[PDB]
Every structure is written in C-alpha cells, then in structure tokens.
Symmetry: C2
Subunit: 882 residues, 2 copies
C-alpha cells in the first residue's frame, strides 16, 4: 500500500509540473511587454521624454521653415514643416566612427545610435554591460535620401557610401556598436513602420529570440523629395500644419523624427527591478488590401485591426479611455478614421462617457516612419502624467464626420482610478499596411557618499557633472545614496573621471566645481588606464599622527572589526588598550606603543581596501612595515605578526636615549661620502629614492650632519625618535630577539613579497627569526625594491598608511626607471588630520580616477537604482549635400 | 483505503489529457510550414522552378557582361555578373497599372507582382479567388536604385515617383492588387533579407496572423552603383564569378534575381489537399554583434545561428545531409563559414560520411537580397529530384580552410532512404545579421473532356493554349479529366476565352489550332461580356432528326432522368414508349409522335442547361414550342404539358393530307403581296426574322408558290409535314380541342414569357384552353417577341433544341434592333446527327466563350487538381534612365 501512496505523490508531481507548464507556455505567449526606457529626437528641440511631454502638454506647434543648412535648391514657395533642429549633429568618436564615415552616414543611422544608447541608460543599464547579450533590434525605416549616388560621390567617402545609407544598417550598426547579438532588422511599412517594428519585437520577446529589444523608427528628410512629390499630386497643407478632425483640414504637414523604446518581458523586468514606464499589451498588423487605390485608406480594414489588437491584448473596446489616432488632417482620411473608431470603440459606449481622441501630428507634424513611435510616447507620457493634451488647430468639428467618440480640444485630465487605464494607438500606412497597439499603465511597485562620474573626454566629464548637479537640485526627493549607487553600478566608466565625496550639500558644490573646471575639497580627478598589478606599500616611522583614524574607527565596520581582531592579538604581548588609545586620540611617544599601533591601523586599512575590491598582487614593507606586509601577504598569522611587532618594539626600548635618526635629501653616494668621516657613528638606515635617504647614529655626530646640511640647502628632517635602528647599536638586542621571537610560523604566501631586508622578492617561508633580526639591523633598500616591481610590470602603488611618506620617493624612483609619460601611478590612503570614511573614499577615488578597478558597492548598502540624466554627446555636424 | 486507489485512476487520466493539450499547443506553436508553390526570376533566363533546376543541374554559369539597355555609363573595365535578361519587362495591363505608373515603378515591384501571381497559380489557386483573404506578404528588399530623384524626374511621371520606389510598396502593392488582407511588410537585412522574410512569415503563420503567406526577396541593380562602390573597396572577383571554397577565390560576383514561396501551415495544406513541395522545419536569425567590423562575418555567431535553427526544427546536426552554404567566394568569409560548419555539423559525424556543401552563387552569382531565397529553392528542388548538383569553379579546395564536411564538386546523388532527408540553408548579411533555415523533404502523399481557357487579350489566350498543348503533350501521366477540372475550377476567367472538347488526341489538335489562330471542330473562341438575362428559345417543326438524343440518353443522367419523367407523364395520353422511340432511333413521321417527343427532348435539354447553372430569365416558344416554354418557365406541370402536347397533336391528325407548309426566305410584306393572289388559300403562319417567314395552306397553291420561288431564286424549304396549321383549316379542330384540353391548370410563372400567340409578354395564368387554340390558329410572330426581348435588354439567346432552326433568324433581327455591335449572342444546343454529350459541351462552350455564366463542375466527377502552366504574361519594357 504505502508505495502506492508515494506512487500518487510523484504521479501527482508529474501532473503538476505539466499543468503549470501549460499555463507557463500560454502565459508566456501573450505576456504583457514592459516599456522600460525611451529616447527621442522630435521637432520642437525635443531630445528627451521630459522635453516631449513639456512641448506637447504645453501645446507647442513646431511647424516652421526648413533649415537653410541642407543645401536644398531655393523655391518661390517656402517649405513649411516639422524639422529637426540639428539633424546632422553626431558624436562619432563616442561610437568609434571616423569623421570620414560619419559624413557618408544617413542621419537616420546616426540618430538611432545616439538614442539607442540613451534609452538603455534610462532603462537602468550601463549599455557596455550588454555587449554579447541577445538583445534584439527592430527599426522602422521608410525612405533614405541622403547621399549622392555612388557615381557622383567624393572619392574620399567611397568606401562608406553604400553601407552608410543602406536601410539594413540603421538596424545592424546599432547591433555592431553596442555588440548586441539578437536578431537585427529594418522594417519598411511606410507610416506604420514604427508600430510594425514594435509588434515584431513583442513577438520576438514572447518567443525568447531575446531577453531585451530596441523598437523604434526614424525619418529624416535629407532632401526635399517629399515636398516635391506631394506638391505634385494633392495632400500638403499650405499651412504646413495638421488640423486633425477639424472643419479646417487642408492636408498633412511634412516632418521628421526618431524614437526608441527598450522593451522587456514584463515578468523579467519585475524580477530585475527595472522601472516599468508602461505596459504594451497586444498589437496587430493588417492590410487594407483591395481599396479604392494604392494610397487610399479603408475603414473596414482599420476596424479589423482594432479588433485583432484588442483580441490580442485581452482587452475590451470599452476599457480603453483614449486613442492616439493617425489624424493627419487629410480630407479623405480623417472622416474614414473617425467612422472606423465610432463603430468599434464607440459602439461599446454610453453617450454619457465617450472615447477620447488626439493626434501629436497637431504638435510636431507628420513625422512619417517615426509617427507611431511618436504616438506611443505621447500615450505613455499621458499615462504617467494623468492628462490628455490639447489637439491644436481645432476650428469646429468637421462636418464630414457623423459623430461616444469625442476629440480632446481643451487639455483634459485622466487620473488613476479603480480600473487600470489604457490607450490605443493607431497608424495607417500609405501603402495599405495598418497597425494598432494597446498600451496600459504600469502596475504597482515598492553619512557621506561617493558620486563617481566619467566622460570619453574632459569636457564630457564636465557636462556629466553639471547635469548631475541640475538633476540633484531639481529633485531633492532623490536619495543621494541611490544616486551614487546608480552612478557606480549602472553607468559606463569612461577615460576622464571624477569622484565627488561628501553629504548632499558637498555633493552639490563638488559637482558644480567639477563642471566649472575647479576642484573642491575631497574630489579626485584623473585619466584612467588599464591597471594590472596593485602593489601595496607598507611604510614605517613618519606615518603616525596623534589622531589616527579616530574617525574611521567610528565610521567604518570593516575597519573597526580588523582593529578589534588586533586588540585581541596584542592583548597578551602588550599592556594597554588599542581602542582607548585611538579613540582617546592619545599621545604616541613610546616606541612600544607606536609601532604595533601603526601595524594594526595599516593592516586594518588593507582590509578596507580589499573589501572595496582592491587586492594586492605584491607587498613591500619598510622596517616595521614588513610585519604588516608579511601579514597582509598571508605569510603570517595575525597572532604571530602581532607578537612580532609587540616584541620587536618592547626590546627596541633598550636603545632609548642613545641615538636619533633623520631623513636627508641626498643619494647613497652623497650620503656615503659625507658620513664616512664619522667612522661608524652614523649609518645609512634606508635608501628610499634617488635623492632620499635616512641616516641613523649617535646624536652629535648626527647634529653636525644635520647642521652641515642645512648650511648648504639640504633637506634634513629630524625624525621624532629616541633610538637608532638599522645601526651597529642593534647588536645588543640580537640575543633577546632571537630568544623570544623563536616560535614564529612563517609560510610561503599567495602574494609576492619584495623584501627590503634581503633586497630580492622572496618565498615568505624564509622569514624565520634570523630574518627578523636582519630587518632591524641591516639597511632597508626600499629604492631597490621599488625598481624591481616597476621592472616586474607593476603600474599601481597604493601606500597603505595613515599618512603618505614614501609616496614622493616612489614617484622619483619611477621617473628614473619607467618609459617617461608611460603609465604607473602612486596613491596614498589617509593623510594627517584626514581619517574617517570620506577621506578613505577620496583615496579610493584617486585610485579609481587613474584606472584601478574599485568595487564601490560597500558604500551603498540596500540602495535601489534611480533615473539619472543621459550621456552628454560631444557632437559635430556632418552633412553631404546633392 | 481503495480511496487512494481511485485517485491513481483519476490522476493518470488527467495526466494524459493535460499532456494532450500541452502537446497540441506546442505543436501548433512550432508546426512545420509547407512550401506549397514557388516562382522565380534568376540569371541564365531562369523564370520557373523547373528552368532553375534544369539550369543548375546542367552546371550552368550565368555570368556575363551587363546589358547595354539600362542607360549605364560605359566603362573601360566591363561589368560582369549575374544579370536579369529582361528586368524592364512587365505586364502592366494585367494588373491595371497605367504605362505612366509602370514607368516610374521600381522593377523590383513589377517582378514581385508577376511571380507572386505565378506562385499562387502553381500552388493551385486562382489568385482572383484570394481577394479579401488573410494572406500576408513578407518581402526581402535591400537597395532600391531605380528612378531619377523627384527633383529631376520628367513632370510626366511625377505623381508616381515616391510610390514607385518605396520599399514598403514591394510588399504592399502585391496585397493591393491581389486584394490580400494579411500583414504586408518589407524587410531589409542586406544579403539575408530573403531568409529573414521567410522566417517572419513562418512565424506569422504559426501565430495565426494569416492562413497563407507569400515570402520572398528581390534585387534588381537598376544602376551600376554597386559596381562602383565595390571597385573602391576590394572584394569583387575580376572574373564575375563566385568560386566558393576553392583556391581560386578572388571575390564575389554581383548578381540580381527574385523568388517567392507560398507558405502554409502543413496541417492546413494537407487538409486542403495541396502539393507539398518541401517543408520548412525551423529557422533562426541573429547578429554577429561585436565583430571585427560592420561587414566582417563572425564564426561564433554563424555557429550560434545554426544551433538555434536546429533547436527550433527539432533536428540533430547529425540528421542533416546537405547545406546550401552562403559561399560567396570571399577570401576572408569562406574559411570562416567552413570552420563554423565543421564545428557544428562536422562535429557530429564520423569522417566516413561527411556533410555536403554547396552554393548556387557559383551558377548565378551573388543575388543579394534574393540570395537565400535562391538557396532554399535549390535545396527544395534538390530534395525533389534527389540530387546534389555540382558546385562550379572548384579548382582545388582552399589551402586557407582547415578541412566530416566536404564540398560537392561533382554531381552526387541523394536517394530517399529510411531517414527523411534534410538540408540547411545559410545566408549572412553584410550588416552582420545572420539566418539559417532547415528544410525537409515532402512527406507521404497519396471520354472526351471540355478544356476551358482565357487571357486578358487574344494573344494571351492563344499563348495559354500553346502552353497547354505542350504541357499535355509532354507529361502524359496527367489525366485529361484532372486537367479539365483544374482549368475550370483553379484558373481565372479572363475576357478572351476558348473551349476545346475532345479526347486527348483531339484536345491536342484543337488546342494547337487555337494557338495558331486556326479553327477545329469542337473548338469555340469568344470575347466575354457580362450578360444580364439568358432567354431560352423553344422552336417547333424542323428541329427533329431520327437519332435525337440516342447518344445523349446514354451519356447524361440529368438528361436520361428527365426523359424518364416524360415517358411517365405521356403514358396515359399516348401508347408508345418514349425511350424505345429515341433509343431505337425510330421514325418520326407522324404528328402524334413527333410533337410529344420534341417537347420531351427540348424540356430535358433545358434541364441540362440548368444543371450547368444556366437559368432562363425569360422564355419564348414557337407554336408547339410554347408548351415546352410554358412548362420550363413553370406555368404548367409536366403532367399538364404532356397532356396538352399529346392531345393537341392527336387532334391535329384530322388535317392530315389536306395542306402543307414551307419556310420562305422573305419578309412579311414581300410574302403578303405575293401570296394575296390566292385569296386565303395560303396564310403567313409565322414570321421569324426580317427575311424569313413560313407559309401554310392548300398544297397546289403552295406548290405554285414554291415553284415560283425556285424560278426567281428564293430560299424555299418544304417542311416535311402533312397539314397546314396557323390557317383557317384549324377551325375544324376548335371544338375537339376545347373539349378535351379542358381541365388544364395554368399558373403564374417564376420566369417571364414573351407569348408569340398574343404578341406581348403575359401572365401565364392566361394560358387556358382559349389561349392554346389561339396558339394553333394564329400567326406566330416570333420576330415581334425577339425584339421585345432585345428592347427589354436580354443579350443571350439559347435555342434549346436538337437542331438550330430559329437561330439564324434571331441574328438578322438583332442587327436591326440592338446597337450594331453592342454584344448579343445567339447559341444553339445540339445539331442534326451531333447529339451526344460532347456536342452539348460544345454548346456550353460557345456560351461560356461569350460570357454566359456556366458552372462546369458536372463534367468532372472524381477529378483531382493537377499542376498546370502559369499565365503567359503579355509584356513591355518600361525603363527610366538617370
Ligand atoms: Cl603626531
């Protein structure tokens, strides 16, 4: 029996895998598609969705004279229509395109690139992240009229003539530049092209040809062909203006434009937390077929497509509150359109609550292949702003139309009620191919910060900064933390970089300064280069200051836990509290106190760096700093290393009052000759750069040296220290160190370690007690180790200290070694009186600004994304006439 | 308990049925698409699948110097490629296109219209029947380079310049002309437009967007632009010739061409019983994305697109025996394709049995946006003839390719084994968009005659007949009956029509005659007009011959059954078998035998006419003929009409040997004056036409008249008859007639009836015994009734008799009456000694040939469709240079 209950179990589990399977399929097959980003270029200086909505709800009329710049033949009868302010302007370099090829490029190809990039940004992607993805591209292109014919083109531009004007390339070139690998195609269906495209993408996503899709359309009138052809037979308003459904309809008005939508499976966008601007729910495409003429509309067909659309959307006619009509202001067409609406959407109505109707063609003109994409944007923007804008140029309603179904003449309201709101959008093509799609409102959702920003060039970076300032200012509801998070995780990191750190008041001013070419406190600025090989430097004396990370101790957890781990390890070997010591901001005179403290702080600073994704490919230490570098490398346990520095320093107390040390701005030879005269009383303690050396020995013999030097313009800094290491005075302590350092467990390490003691880079199992005596006795030789790393192809040096002290030496050593103005950089961590996170973020910012890979995320826990301005294209005009 | 027992019983049942539904949704979703017809226009004078194959397996090289006639600027280096014989030739009239519009039309549009028609004809449709259907149009168009610009176009062709070159219109114009209502769009993917289109079409079908779809692509190089662009960049073979995969590869060879497929859901085409040529099993489209360069192909993507295509087909790489590689002979591209095939298909084979590879581009060149339609056609054809044709120009295999997977270099053969054979066909776009599709062999399928045919002009009709004769002569496996059926039910009925009746040998000879402008027996030829009103004419004496219907009684059930029904109605009134009378070919001397049989024959012939969908709108009788007419028009039951004619004829025996009748060739008044001298001894019995009358009276006085005419040369024909009806001698009969014709029950009739007794049209309830005596006593006046039908706009007179006796008179009347040469046709039925079904079909033919609606179906019982020649287009050259 029991087996034939567990037999039920798995038999029921098959049966369940299958039912939910069938739903999945069927659900997927009609799944709503989310419009997740947009971007446009319309008449009226429209370059954003924000601008489009301003222009339209504002009741803008864009119709005007055709620009002079195109090299059009003059005409007695001025050419009126909806033109694009800067149709020939393009940032070619951004896209890897030579000036020569950009010149042979159909403006329609160019614009598409720009806006495709913009739209993915607004969708929440760093578009570079999408290279190699299966993203689709579906573009509606009607006419191309840009080039001269191959047969009369300048020889300069001949390679790029065909490819630069071929309709297929409007699609493909987007795929080739953003490295997309889904299907890419250009669709021609005249006016409805734009929706044909959109429909094709929806179906592509529903079948899984891709996860993501770019659906758009473009028309740019490079020549006055259309004017000529329409001024031939009838159709153009003398006004240049579209008066949809009015008494006063003359004919349509020619225009140009471009629009894109990032489309994604609704469920997929929810899972990834992308913003849903609106949902497309179903669409349909048909032909009017046997009409009265090739270019005649046919209402019966228009009706048929409204129904197929609604069948597909799974929506009822009466549920749609508004329609974005074709509405071209034609004498034949407007009536036909309205009658087809009346007997579809209107049949299912009260008089008491009619269908509402508009046309953006009253604002921007007949934008042709883009018209439709133009209509879907208006519809989306209307669903997001709760308002139906004015349809311009409405005399009286047209007396050719037999009027459920009204036109919106004064701007109306459209608020979120019980039902979702939806809109239909239609565009009907001159060649007979009609399209209608159904749009729904989006369904329901829900200290200091480093702001990181980039430009392909220096001016772009500065534009980036200014627009971020404007955005932040005109939008105090936006979290600073989400703004930084988005900037860090969802924007491309270009060559010229800036990092502005601080709270909101500071974040604003830092950005405005970056914009105006100035630098505010805590800003990092640089040019990135690929960096492979982070060497962490670990210095010794001269890196302490009375505060030392009082603030960082409070403001960072990674740092404070590291420290805790230290106070625990040094507990046995030392009798004072690390924390009381740092938190208190207590004096740091004693050797037996300073050195282990510096050890903890520097190890703790290393932990922070690693938590922000910066890992050492090698480590170099300096005197005491080799203990930290040894631990960080992995050659020592914290317990070992802690004991080591605690013991070293306890013993070193024995030399107290018997010598001093001082740094001098000269070379080993210079110093070697000068010092030779005191036979043995002084020794060179370290050589840190071609013109920097420490000398150690008996004070008096030292003072004569310090005195003599200042009297000849030599750098000669007392180190505030009462002993003299790296000198023959250390033979006294040889016994005691070998005695109670014994029991140390060195291990070969993951990371390279370039010994200063030895002079070579080493297997770190070498570092027995015998080694550690030598580190205190023998001369340091940091200059030597620097060169070895330089020569070994390290390009990034991070001086992991509370104050930079070897930084300057290092750069001088790299002047003398690396190919001048090729590469390597040097970067510190904290600085005197500059502890606390913000200043660590500024040190990250410097490393990052020069091309170190940093993981910024730890500075933004939680932190959803947020909508930011778009890349500021550095444009130039390219235009080839006829 | 058995509780759980019951539940395993349930669960299994729902497991099973849930899996049936899931199975059925998933099948539908990706069901095989059938290629059910195809047409084309390729280099080497290829204009049909058959001529394509002949060309290709003959190892044909179409490469040649471009035609001089396109207005191309001559050039020092001659332009070699695959050029379309006559790209400028179009039948504009067939499609209702003006010469002015045709001139400004891109030839890519024109060629598409023609072959879309041809393809539908081959798929076994009358394209006309598809008007208003949901058939979609998907068309690969790359470049369009035809016109001058609207700036510089002759003002003569100006209103048609934009429409004539719009890419979208290649798709749309087809749907406009054929009246198709599916989604119609154009696609630009450069060289893979072809397959892309077919892929979109495959999916539209699978989404039930349409039931049928035309998928194709075109390129016509109207200008030398491409030659110009590629002679700057490198890449063209100096040869003109693609040598795919050979050491000899210089570059590709520009070419042009055009191809369509009629696609349909496989289940549906089986359901509709339609030739499945091959089957599209699966496809894919992708982008090679971040390649080396826009135009550079990329192996990884080529492999990806193959594997996606295979997945969708549900086919293993191992299961595919041939691939139509893109193979354009490019030095860079060829190796990349062969490597990508090697690691997809050639991974899954042991060397022993490799994948075979070819490229038609070696025969016809790189046919650009049509290439790949060209490819799928070669594969479909190869599957059908079981042969892999030779890939030309194969010097040696390329030493740059790293050779599972071999190039077919000598014509291998491909037999239908235990596996279904399949092919892949790839084509790769210069903008980086790739397609691959998978094609499977077609699955398991299993007297004299009237041939009808037509053309929009006379030349087309004759050409149509020539093509039929050839087709019938060359392919004897196609039944004549099936051929007749297809012509009648699957071909449009154009203005100029011919009908040929015969067994096969005589159908050939008649067909060949019509083709030569000659005539044969059982061959009718006409110009059709819509004819509003068939008037059936029923004559009297003269129409009989001794055979009458013996043949037709055996060959026609509709007829034999009607004769059976009469025999039954006459039996009470007459003591001789109608059947034995007609079957035994027995003499018809006596009045009481003739008149009833002639009625029974004439009434059953009417039945035939009606069984082929010819209804009288009006009828006319001539003496006894009125009886038939009255019954046919449904004023008298068969039982009444039978009684009437039996009695009327029996009583008429009383005048035997007392007079006579004879038809004279002269008009009423000419007869009247010539006859009046025998005061009353002769009567004008009937006036039938303006120069034909019948005279009844006392023989003697009648012999004098006849003698007096043969003296002066008048048509003077003795009617082989004992008596003199329609004369005073009929008073003797009045009483007996009225006495036993009483009881007759006439009623108002459905159909009109233009009484020859009265002189008018009538209410047929009128036709009581008083009327019927008048019908015998009175002058007939057929001419007055003829004109009354003319004057009331009947245009089609059918003489429903066994021998045409009134036919010539009617025609002399309608000269007078109707506008001289506005239309009218006068048709007989059978002829003396030409009874028999086939002669009836010939009568039907003369009526069909002139525009009477005939329903031919009854001639073919058990007839299946059969493939036939396509419309012979009547073409002119239209070409606008630059
Ligand atoms: Cl200090």
């Amino acid at each position: 029996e029991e087996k034939l209950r567990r037999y039920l179990k798995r038999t029921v589990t098959e049966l369940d895998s299958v039912t939910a399977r069938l739903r999945e399929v069927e659900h997927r097959a009609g799944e709503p598609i989310a419009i997740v980003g947009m971007a446009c270029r319309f008449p009226g200086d429209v370059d954003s969705p924000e601008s489009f909505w301003e222009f339209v709800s504002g009741g803008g009329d864009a119709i005007a004279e055709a620009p002079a710049d195109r090299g059009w033949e003059p005409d007695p009868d001025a050419r009126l229509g909806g033109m694009l302010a800067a149709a020939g302007d393009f940032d070619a370099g951004f896209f890897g395109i030579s000036p020569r090829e950009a010149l042979a490029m159909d403006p329609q190809q160019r614009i598409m690139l720009e806006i495709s990039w913009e739209a993915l940004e607004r969708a929440g992607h760093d578009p570079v992240s999408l290279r190699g993805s299966a993203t689709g591209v579906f573009t509606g292109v009607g006419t191309v009229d840009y080039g001269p014919r191959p047969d009369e083109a300048p020889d300069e531009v001949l390679g790029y003539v065909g490819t630069g004007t071929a309709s297929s390339v409007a699609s493909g070139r987007v795929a080739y530049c953003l490295g997309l690998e889904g299907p890419a195609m250009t669709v021609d269906t005249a006016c409805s092209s734009g929706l044909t495209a959109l429909h094709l993408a929806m179906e592509s996503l529903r079948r899984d040809e891709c996860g993501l899709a770019l659906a758009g359309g473009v028309t740019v009138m490079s020549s006055p062909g259309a004017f000529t052809e329409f001024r031939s037979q009838g159709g153009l308003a003398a006004d240049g203006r579209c008066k949809p459904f009015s008494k006063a309809a003359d004919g349509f008005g020619l225009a140009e434009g471009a629009g894109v939508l990032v489309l994604q499976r609704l469920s997929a966008a929810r899972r990834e937390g992308r913003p849903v601007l609106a949902v497309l729910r179903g669409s349909a495409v048909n032909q009017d077929g046997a009409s009265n003429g090739l270019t005649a509309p046919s209402g019966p067909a228009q009706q048929r497509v409204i129904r197929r659309a609604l069948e597909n959307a799974g929506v009822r006619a009466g549920d749609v509150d508004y329609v974005e009509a074709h509405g071209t202001g034609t004498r034949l067409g407007d009536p036909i359109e309205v009658h087809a609406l009346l007997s579809t959407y209107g049949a299912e109505r009260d008089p008491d609550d009619p269908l509402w109707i508009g046309s953006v063609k009253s604002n921007i003109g007949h934008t042709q292949a883009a018209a439709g994409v133009a209509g879907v944007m208006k519809a989306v923007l209307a669903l997001r702003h709760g308002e139906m804008p004015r349809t311009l140029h409405f005399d009286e309603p047209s007396p050719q139309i037999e009027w459920a179904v009204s036109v919106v003449s004064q701007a109306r309201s459209w608020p979120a009620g019980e039902r979702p709101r939806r809109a239909g959008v239609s565009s009907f093509g001159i060649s007979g191919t009609n399209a209608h799609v159904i749009v729904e409102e989006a369904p329901e959702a829900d200290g200091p910060v480093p702001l990181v920003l980039s430009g392909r060039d220096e001016q772009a970076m500065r534009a980036q900064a200014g627009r971020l300032a404007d955005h932040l200012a005109r939008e105090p509801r936006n979290s600073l933390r989400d703004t930084g998070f988005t900037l860090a995780t969802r924007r491309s990191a270009w060559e010229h970089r800036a990092v502005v750190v601080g709270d909101r008041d500071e974040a604003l001013a830092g950005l405005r300064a970056v914009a105006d070419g100035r630098i505010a406190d805590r800003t990092a600025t640089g040019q990135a280069r690929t960096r492979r090989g982070v060497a962490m430097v670990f210095p010794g004396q001269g890196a302490q200051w009375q505060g030392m990370a009082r603030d960082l101790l409070r403001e960072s957890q990674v740092f404070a836990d590291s420290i805790r781990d230290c106070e625990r390890a040094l507990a046995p070997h030392v009798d004072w509290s690390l924390t009381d010591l740092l938190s208190g901001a207590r004096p740091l005179d004693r050797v037996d106190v300073v050195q282990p403290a510096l050890f903890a702080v520097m190890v703790s600073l290393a932990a922070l760096w690693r938590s922000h994704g910066v890992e050492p490919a090698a480590v170099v230490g300096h005197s005491q700093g080799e203990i930290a570098a040894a631990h960080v490398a992995g050659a020592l346990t914290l317990e070992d290393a802690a004991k080591l520095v605690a013991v070293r320093s306890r013993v070193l107390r024995r030399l107290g009052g018997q010598g001093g040390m001082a740094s001098f701005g000269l070379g080993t030879e210079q110093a070697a000759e000068r010092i030779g005269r005191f036979a043995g009383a002084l020794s060179i303690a370290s050589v840190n750069g071609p013109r920097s050396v420490v000398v150690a020995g008996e004070s008096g013999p030292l003072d004569e040296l310090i005195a003599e030097c200042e009297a000849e313009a030599h750098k000669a800094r007392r180190i505030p220290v009462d002993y003299a290491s790296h000198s023959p005075q250390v033979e006294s302590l040889r016994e005691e160190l070998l005695t109670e350092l014994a029991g140390i467990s060195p291990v070969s390490a993951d990371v390279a370690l370039y010994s200063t003691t030895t002079g070579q880079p080493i297997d770190t199992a070498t570092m027995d007690t015998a080694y550690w005596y030598a580190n205190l006795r023998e001369q340091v030789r940091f200059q030597d180790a620097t060169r070895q790393l330089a020569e070994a192809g390290f390009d990034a040096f991070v001086e992991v200290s509370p104050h930079p002290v070897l930084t300057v030496g290092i750069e001088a050593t790299l002047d003398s070694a690396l190919p001048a103005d090729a590469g390597a950089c040097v970067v510190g961590t904290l600085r005197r009186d500059r502890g606390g996170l913000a200043d660590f973020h500024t040190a990250l910012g410097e490393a990052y600004a020069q091309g170190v890979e940093v993981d910024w995320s730890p500075a933004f826990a939680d932190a959803r994304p947020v909508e930011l301005p778009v890349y500021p294209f550095q444009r130039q005009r390219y235009w080839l006439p006829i």
